[PDB]
């Protein structure tokens, strides 16, 4: 029949076809010889830093392009004001080098940005975004002040709101505007002697990078970090956190009430900050985003991964599981009652949570609408489905098809 | 060019460079990504309107040749020459060549090897190969087929085993299993829409009514076979009881858990595929090892459109069915997987769990990276559909590809 990707959903036994994929404009990783779809850093996603500006030319029609998108999005294609926005870019590509967004449009191209997220299940909430203009920012004190005022609009005492804050974007013949942790709250990772990692082993080299910049460090295992912000051309200067900014969530099981006793806890403000933001060939070094957390996130991946907190064993001893055979899947058990307390701990807190469950339901209906709405939506089914109880999902049986649409978040080397 | 493959638990690295020997395409293109398709149009090796191009059949049985005589250790023997002698000659004259029972041996081993989609290729020296190249009938089908089953079977202590049935032949029909594996249960479409027994057998079902078969009304009553001789209507074949062993389910805790009524059959043998070796197709080749405790407590007995027990144990466990945060189905789920390893346990009959499968995959993976530069797999298949993160292949980065000797979709002969 038609000449694009037919997807199928297995437990409904519906079909669909992506017409979407027709409008990207970025090659990915795959060719016809063989599927790079699950390499998490594939050199089709990162964007090289560029020490020299792009081809005016090129730039000319990421950004033509995506006035279009815009205009489309307001329905005026092809109008005057169109036409004229167009000359506008290219005139100012023309003697700049590069051009400027206006208000609205970077509030599309951020909204859009987040839509077109192939790994991002809670797309369905895309139009929902609280975009903090932040193109002003001139120092890395600023970079300060602007990231406590999201922080604190976005946490709101537990009832988060997405929201992202673009800071000034990439300037030929002038330095990039970073943030040098991965996310806006993290904690410390501290390199043993005996080899081992108190903390969280995933942020081992920010916290070194911390400590060389003046941080002192502390010793516990759910240490916040504190910000290493960049501005242009100068290196990066520390600021610490208040602690009152920082809300956390100590965890505790419904049943279990030895789990208490454990000690561990989570922050409630998920924001990443080390990926770069895509609109119209314009690129934002430093545009931290967040919105809250699925359950499993927290209390499978940060939790139970065996590069980060890997308290699967110590749970599962505390439930006195044999933990000595596989087959009494005491992996399985411990995870089930570890996710069921961030679930639990959130919930009492009055902190914003959501389940996979839920979270993949809303997906699907998101599908829908997008289905309807450009014809496909950009999906990258390994991160998609929940890294536990896969196939318990509606989501597991949706085949997906994934490619690059911009607006888009990219990932970006290390400042350093 | 060579794909950089990276382990996020280890930090590990390795290059891909097996897949420079892939010859066929899937459904990627560098402007999407295709690789969650269970079946696409492309890879599956549909019935053709003749003849195989002498120039390509050549080509990829002078390559299997040379594959075989390689893996003896006799690669540029005379015995090797002789071979690729034999085979131009014949294709020249026939416009097709046969295979010797010892190539089809290492050929098929190669096609199990090769399979993206399987977990337990650790395994995949081990295979009984019964050569049925020699049969012309659907009854003497059967009879290679209840071998097959009294063997692989074993009293519970499970083989790996594969039944080849005659080559295609252009202009002539195939011989076909209906049956997508030898032993399923049947699904009734009762009155009201809803489907007793097996779901994703309702069709299966059907088609066997259609030509005869007197159907019971039980949620797993064994199948019939509907086997098919080219050219020929299929024929109804019932397997013996006694051949076809099954396992009752119970929980090693909950009593109630064997009320249910719930069990499943021992042997899962595949018998819809395709295995291609040197440009031969093999459009009948039933094959079968042993479960994953995966497939049935999560997949047969768990999904939506299966069985889709889910709830009804939430109830027996007596959980809050209310909200999806509770994680009932996830608690329903860890029980049912029980389950079904304490049943196959204790009634003494292979199975392998999630935990112990993908280890024996990692390991795998690494014999493969130092015997051909890398292995081919495809990830949302080889993680397990629950725990995922909580196994090591979940971490693994993977490369996809199509190598030869291989088992392919195909259509349904009907
Ligand atoms: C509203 C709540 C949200 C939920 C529940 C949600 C959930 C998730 C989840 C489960 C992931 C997987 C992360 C991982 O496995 O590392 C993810 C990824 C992602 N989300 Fe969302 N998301 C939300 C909001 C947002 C917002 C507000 C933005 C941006 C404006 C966004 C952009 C993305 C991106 C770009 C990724 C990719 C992460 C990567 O490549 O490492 N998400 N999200
Ligand atoms: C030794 C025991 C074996 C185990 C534990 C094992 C396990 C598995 C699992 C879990 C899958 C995915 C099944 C699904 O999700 O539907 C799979 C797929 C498959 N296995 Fe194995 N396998 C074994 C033996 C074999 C043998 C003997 C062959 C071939 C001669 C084989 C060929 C394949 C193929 C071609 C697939 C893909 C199935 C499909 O596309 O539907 N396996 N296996
Ligand atoms: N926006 C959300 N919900 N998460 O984005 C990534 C968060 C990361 N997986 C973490 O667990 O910290
Ligand atoms: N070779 C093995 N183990 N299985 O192959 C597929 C069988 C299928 N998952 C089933 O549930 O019957
Ligand atoms: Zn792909």
Same mark, same amino acid.
């Given at each position: ?56 030319? /090129? ?109 000034? /974007? ?41 400590? /060389? ?204």
């Amino acid at each position: 029949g038609p000449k694009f990707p037919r997807v199928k959903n297995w437990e409904l036994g519906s079909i669909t076809y992506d017409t979407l994929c027709a409008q990207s404009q970025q090659d990915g990783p795959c060719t016809p010889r063989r599927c790079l779809g699950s390499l998490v850093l594939p050199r089709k996603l990162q964007t090289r830093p560029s020490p020299g500006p792009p081809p005016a030319e /090129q730039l000319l029609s990421q950004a033509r392009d995506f006035i279009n998108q815009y205009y489309s999005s307001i329905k005026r294609s092809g109008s005057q004001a169109h036409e004229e926005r167009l000359q506008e870019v290219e005139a100012e590509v023309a003697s700049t080098g590069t051009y400027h967004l206006r208000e609205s449009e970077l509030v599309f191209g951020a909204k859009q940005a987040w839509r077109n997220a192939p790994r991002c299940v809670g797309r369905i909430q895309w139009g929902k975004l609280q975009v903090f203009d932040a193109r002003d920012c001139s120092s890395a004190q600023e970079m300060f002040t602007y990231i406590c005022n999201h922080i604190k609009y976005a946490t709101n005492r537990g009832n988060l709101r997405s929201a992202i804050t673009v800071f000034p /974007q990439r300037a030929p013949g002038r330095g990039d505007f970073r943030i040098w942790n991965s996310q806006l709250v993290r904690y410390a990772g501290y390199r043993q002697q005996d080899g081992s990692v108190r903390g969280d082993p995933a942020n081992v080299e920010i916290t070194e990078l911390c400590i /060389q910049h003046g941080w002192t460090p502390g010793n516990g295992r759910f240490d916040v970090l504190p910000l290493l912000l960049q501005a242009p051309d100068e290196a990066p200067e520390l600021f610490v956190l208040p602690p009152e900014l920082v809300l956390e969530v100590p965890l505790e099981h419904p049943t279990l009430e030895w789990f208490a006793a454990l000690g561990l806890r989570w922050y409630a403000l998920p924001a990443v900050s080390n990926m770069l933001l895509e609109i119209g060939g314009l690129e934002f070094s430093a545009a931290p985003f967040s919105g809250w957390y699925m359950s499993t996130e927290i209390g499978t991946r940060n939790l139970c991964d065996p590069h980060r907190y890997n308290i699967l064993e110590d749970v599962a001893v505390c439930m006195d599981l044999d933990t000595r055979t596989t087959s009494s899947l005491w992996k399985d058990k411990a995870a089930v009652e570890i996710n069921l307390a961030v679930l639990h701990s959130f919930q009492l807190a009055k902190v914003t949570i959501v389940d996979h469950h839920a979270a993949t339901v809303s997906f699907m209906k998101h599908l829908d609408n997008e289905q309807k709405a450009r014809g496909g939506c950009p999906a990258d089914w390994a991160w998609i489905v929940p890294p536990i109880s896969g196939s318990l999902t509606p989501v597991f049986h949706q085949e997906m098809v994934n490619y690059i649409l911009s607006p888009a978040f990219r990932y970006q080397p290390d400042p350093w």
